[PDB]
Design a protein around this ligand. Structure first.
Ligand SMILES: COc1cc2cc(c1Cl)N(C)C(=O)C[C@H](OC(=O)C(C)C)[C@]1(C)O[C@H]1[C@H](C)[C@H]1C[C@](O)(NC(=O)O1)[C@@H](OC)/C=C\C=C(/C)C2
Ligand SMILES: C/C(=C/c1csc(C)n1)[C@@H]1C[C@H]2O[C@H]2CCC[C@@H](C)[C@H](O)[C@@H](C)C(=O)C(C)(C)[C@@H](O)CC(=O)O1
Ligand SMILES: Nc1nc2c(ncn2[C@@H]2O[C@H](COP(=O)(O)OP(=O)(O)OP(=O)(O)O)[C@@H](O)[C@H]2O)c(=O)[nH]1
Ligand SMILES: Nc1nc2c(ncn2[C@@H]2O[C@H](COP(=O)(O)OP(=O)(O)O)[C@@H](O)[C@H]2O)c(=O)[nH]1
Ligand SMILES: [Ca+2]
Ligand SMILES: [Mg+2]
Ligand SMILES: [Mg+2]
Lengths: 440, 430, 69
């Protein structure tokens, strides 16, 4: 029980899903044809990985996942790739014409022609669950499909599953790899439309990831392949609580309680350590102390911002591999003193800590060194508002002149939807300001 | 995705024929239409410009139109004249005599239905049509007058598809027909309202490139058209080979056109050298970048230093270092920050394709949306007003039924277009 | 205490129903407005193109009138 359904939307959502499911298979020992020689219960079972894999009578372990895109070329690569035998053809849904980087086409003109079919495939997956926990939705902010169609899907999921929880994994745009000049528009529109339908969203800043790959992995010009492989390690760390079980393993829902103090404030900042190449790790055994310390370096954040200039409302450390409580205690004790970690005065307990004993794994031919221990930190800091500020400024510059707006209006949108989306962003920036203010 | 290609009039069919030549070799198609290439990358997107017929034969999705039988006979005889579908030749008899009114209203109107039947036939067979591309000149009669009439009729039947033109502006340095400013203005008035993207291919700049840069004493139409084919192959690279940026006509439009009327692009190609200078100058990414943004390399007679870029697309082709490209493009933006509008962040996009054009190790193509284009329109307006001031030749036009103020309508509209560019060139972010 | 326990459970049910109801209605009304707005943008553009076809035919009639002199 406690099953989770994954929904991968648009190019970024699809390609990141491919990276994730390959990593999951390696972690659980599932083969590219779905066989899992380790699994003794055939046809079913209530094991931990069953939260993400269903089983067929023949012993196939099938991702509880839907890939959807408005054009075919990206999902076509899944249909013909190493793990093509892993998915049933109906879990891969493609259109003929994409959103053209236009939220309006994704939410309306094109999306409305495939939404019912997508919601149908999802129902079929939900019907195979005994205790469906919720959804994980992977998408870009900038794409026409990642923004517009993802919004439509989320609104539809609220209608069909009520309060059932929906978590987002979102790619925040960066000029170093951005495919469209209008991505700030699509970003604000999808964030406005989705804010009240999402329980918790993990933002990944492409520029942050881009820089980490360049600096820590020694890749001069990172590609999506480099970025997604790193992203997948963060995703694996967050879901590892659900796919494995350990005496010190703590569930992601217990983290969510600590991470979301108010409905709208549901955007944790992620970090991950160690990020190091085989060459550098050859002569360097990284201790719990070193990787814990790295979580508080501004340059290791998955979104570009400065948490020293903000206040923490929560820190959750998800350790995995060779880690024992004594070492964690000493590590945090050190960090508390040598660092300037400021918590709001309304949060009595700021740290939550768990250990998953499953060691980190890496895909052969990847860029990450294989390490004995790793840590992922999810924190809720007001500093993440800096990312909203930067987006909103790019929006305002273009919108003041109505640049490109005719593309959205021509597709059926009104200007009011723009300024409504922008005003919502203004309130969000203010909300992050007020939670940080000391109590009277 | 599929694109339907239409080419009208002398110029349109000349540069169109060259376009099919150049890209057919890039993809490995001989004049018989058989595939003879060596990499699966050539066939990935082959269906954008080619239908597949029984026997693995690839036929251009191209329609050939002209009021004059002459020019299409010769296209049939030129290289690759046999790879075109025969029923897709739609030709008249009278000819247009460089008379815009004949192409748009009388002679061209009688033949437009025949073209529409072929366009429906071709769009019928498309899995998911993306839109149309048209080659023509603005100075003649058929490509000009009947060219814009086709766009009008096609837009009626396919209102939600992309309309893309390659428009050759007149220049007295290359033609001596004195009414070309009339014909260009009457059609610039149609393009400003009925196309989504227009590449402005200016015979003035083409000639200047051959004289000053290429050191060609007396350039010919063969020369001018080699620059065009090189350019057209460049601006369609990202549509014909697997990529991510500007992968289709609509994504290109959404990235290049911030306001509906300002959809006139100025292209540029590089490298460009004279025979003597090619030996003592190795082509590098810094050399390609500098040339790309130099006014000497613009396919439209405009100095970008006289206006400001709203949007820019840059396509590099060849084996090079992605990192070098990223650095070279940031540096040029840095040094020339004053020439990019600040109210459109990150308005320069760059693509890299692995396969080079044939004959070069490296090439770079430039697609600029710049307020400096207004210099091109100001030039035509200047010649239009000189002619119209003394009402030279209108009885040829009014004799087909046209009204006088229809001329002043076009001129006035083109004037508003110039002011529009000035309005956004002078706008600031504060 | 028992009246209050039912009160609370029924309020939880009502807030979830109202959440579904508003999402349902907001979505419905947005699909509706977009349909109208996009169809009107196309009608406008097509109405304009035909107004040009009208002028062309008038340009043809005009040619014959001068043609009888
Ligand atoms: C005043 O001395 C001149 C006397 C003539 C031509 C010119 C001059 Cl300047 N030229 C060159 C021009 O001014 C440009 C252009 O000339 C031509 O197109 C022509 C060279 C083919 C034209 C007359 O202004 C064009 C009209 C719209 C006219 C052109 C046409 O009569 N047909 C038509 O419908 O309209 C055309 O048909 C092919 C016949 C030929 C006329 C000729 C040769 C006389
Ligand atoms: C083939 C070339 C090679 C080159 C190698 S190094 C460098 C700076 N240029 C370039 C580019 C060609 O795409 C063509 C655009 C220019 C038109 C010429 C083909 C032109 O028509 C022709 C008559 C010439 O001037 C040359 C043959 C000298 C041509 O090589 C010049 C040129 O820039 O071609
Ligand atoms: N990290 C990461 N970002 C990606 C990837 N693919 C695209 N992006 C980013 O996502 C944005 C573009 O959105 P896409 O996901 O490509 O678009 P889409 O959802 O397919 O939308 P349309 O194609 O317009 O219908 C840009 O900011 C890209 O840099 C990927 O594999 N990884
Ligand atoms: N660059 C270029 N311009 C051309 C070519 N042929 C004609 N033109 C130009 O096109 C204009 C006349 O249009 P043309 O195609 O001859 O007339 P049409 O047949 O009535 O469309 C003049 O400005 C010519 O210089 C050509 O092959 N290349
Ligand atoms: Ca089992
Ligand atoms: Mg896409
Ligand atoms: Mg001619």
């Amino acid at each position: 029980m406690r099953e989770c359904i994954s929904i991968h939307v648009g190019q970024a959502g699809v390609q990141i899903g491919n990276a994730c499911w390959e990593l999951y298979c390696l972690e659980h020992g599932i083969q590219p044809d779905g066989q899992m020689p380790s699994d003794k219960t055939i046809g079913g079972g209530d094991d931990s990985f069953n939260t993400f894999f269903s089983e067929t009578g023949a012993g196939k372990h099938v991702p509880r996942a839907v890939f959807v895109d408005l054009e075919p070329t990206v999902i076509d690569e899944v249909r013909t790739g190493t793990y093509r035998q892993l998915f049933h053809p109906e879990q891969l849904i493609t259109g003929k014409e994409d959103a053209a980087n236009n939220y309006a086409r994704g939410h309306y003109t094109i999306g409305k022609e495939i939404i019912d079919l997508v919601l149908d495939r999802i129902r079929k997956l939900a019907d195979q669950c005994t205790g469906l926990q919720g959804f994980l939705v992977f998408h870009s902010f900038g794409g026409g499909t990642g923004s517009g169609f993802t919004s439509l899907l989320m609104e539809r999921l609220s209608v069909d599953y009520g309060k059932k929880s929906k978590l987002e994994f979102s790619i925040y745009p960066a000029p170093q790899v951005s495919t469209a000049v209008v991505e700030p528009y699509n970003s604000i529109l999808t964030t406005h439309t989705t804010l009240e339908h999402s329980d918790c969203a993990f933002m990944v800043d492409n520029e942050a990831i881009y820089d980490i790959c360049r600096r820590n992995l020694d890749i001069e010009r990172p590609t999506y392949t480099n970025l997604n492989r790193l992203i997948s390690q963060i995703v694996s760390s967050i879901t590892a609580s659900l796919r494995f079980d350990g005496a010190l393993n703590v569930d992601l829902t217990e983290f969510q309680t600590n991470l979301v103090p108010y409905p709208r404030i549901h955007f944790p900042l992620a970090t991950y350590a160690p990020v190091i190449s085989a060459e550098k790790a050859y002569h360097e055994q990284l201790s719990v102390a070193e990787i814990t310390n790295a979580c508080f370096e501004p340059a290791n954040q998955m979104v570009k911002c400065d948490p020293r200039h903000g206040k923490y409302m929560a820190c959750c450390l998800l350790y995995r591999g060779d880690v024992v409580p004594k070492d964690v205690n000493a590590a945090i004790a050190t960090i508390k003193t040598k660092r300037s970690i400021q918590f709001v005065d309304w949060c009595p307990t700021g740290f939550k800590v768990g250990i998953n004993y499953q060691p980190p794994t890496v895909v052969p031919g990847g860029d990450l060194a294989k390490v004995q221990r790793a840590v992922c930190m999810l924190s809720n800091t007001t500093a993440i508002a800096e990312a909203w500020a930067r987006l909103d400024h790019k929006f305002d510059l273009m919108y003041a002149k109505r640049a490109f707006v005719h593309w959205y209006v021509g597709e059926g949108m009104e200007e009011g939807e723009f300024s409504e989306a922008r005003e919502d962003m203004a309130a969000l920036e203010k909300d992050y300001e007020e939670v940080g203010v000391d109590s009277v | 995705r599929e694109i339907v290609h239409i080419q009208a009039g002398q110029c349109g069919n000349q540069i169109g024929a060259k376009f099919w030549e150049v890209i057919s070799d890039e993809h490995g198609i001989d004049p018989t239409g058989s595939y003879h290439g060596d990499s699966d990358l050539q066939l990935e997107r082959i269906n954008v410009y080619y239908n597949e017929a029984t026997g693995n034969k690839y036929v251009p999705r191209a329609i050939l139109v002209d009021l004059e039988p002459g020019t299409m006979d010769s296209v049939r005889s030129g290289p690759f004249g046999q790879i075109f579908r025969p029923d897709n030749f739609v030709f008249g008899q009278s000819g247009a005599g460089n008379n815009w009114a004949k192409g748009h209203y009388t002679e061209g109107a009688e033949l437009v239905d025949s073209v529409l039947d072929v366009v429906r036939k071709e769009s019928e067979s498309c899995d998911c049509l993306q839109g149309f591309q048209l080659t023509h000149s603005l100075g003649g009669g058929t490509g000009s007058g009947m060219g814009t009439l086709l766009i009008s009729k096609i837009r009626e039947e396919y209102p939600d598809r992309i309309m893309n033109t390659f428009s050759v502006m007149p220049s007295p340095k290359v033609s001596d027909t004195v009414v070309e400013p009339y014909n260009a203005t009457l059609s610039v008035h149609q393009l400003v309202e009925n196309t989504d993207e227009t590449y402005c291919i200016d015979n003035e700049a083409l000639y200047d490139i051959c004289f000053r840069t290429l050191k060609l004493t007396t350039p010919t139409y063969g020369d001018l058209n080699h620059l065009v084919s090189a350019t057209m192959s460049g601006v369609t690279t990202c549509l014909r080979f697997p990529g991510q940026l500007n992968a289709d006509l609509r994504k290109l439009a959404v990235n290049m056109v911030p306001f509906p009327r300002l959809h006139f692009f100025m292209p540029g190609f590089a490298p460009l050298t004279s025979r003597g200078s090619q030996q003592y100058r190795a082509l590098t990414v810094p050399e390609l970048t500098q040339q790309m943004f130099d006014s000497k390399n613009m396919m439209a007679a405009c100095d970008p230093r006289h206006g400001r870029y709203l949007t820019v697309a840059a396509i590099f082709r060849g084996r090079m270092s992605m990192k070098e490209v990223d650095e070279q493009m940031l540096n040029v933006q840095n040094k020339n920050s004053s020439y990019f509008v600040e109210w459109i962040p990150n308005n320069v996009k760059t693509a890299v394709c692995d396969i080079p054009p044939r004959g070069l190790k490296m090439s770079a193509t430039f697609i600029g949306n710049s307020t400096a284009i207004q210099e091109l329109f100001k030039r035509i307006s200047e010649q239009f007003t000189a002619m119209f001031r003394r009402k030279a030749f209108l009885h040829w036009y009014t004799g087909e039924g046209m009204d006088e103020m229809e001329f002043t309508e076009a001129e006035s509209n083109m004037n508003d277009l110039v002011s529009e560019y000035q309005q956004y060139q002078d706008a600031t972010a504060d | 205490k028992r009246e209050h326990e039912r009160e609370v459970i029924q309020k939880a049910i009502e807030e979830n129903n109202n959440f579904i109801k508003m999402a349902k209605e907001k979505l419905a009304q947005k699909m509706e407005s977009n349909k109208e707005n996009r169809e009107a943008h196309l009608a406008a553009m097509l109405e304009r193109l035909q107004e040009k076809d009208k002028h062309a035919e008038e340009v043809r009639k005009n040619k014959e009138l001068k043609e009888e002199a």
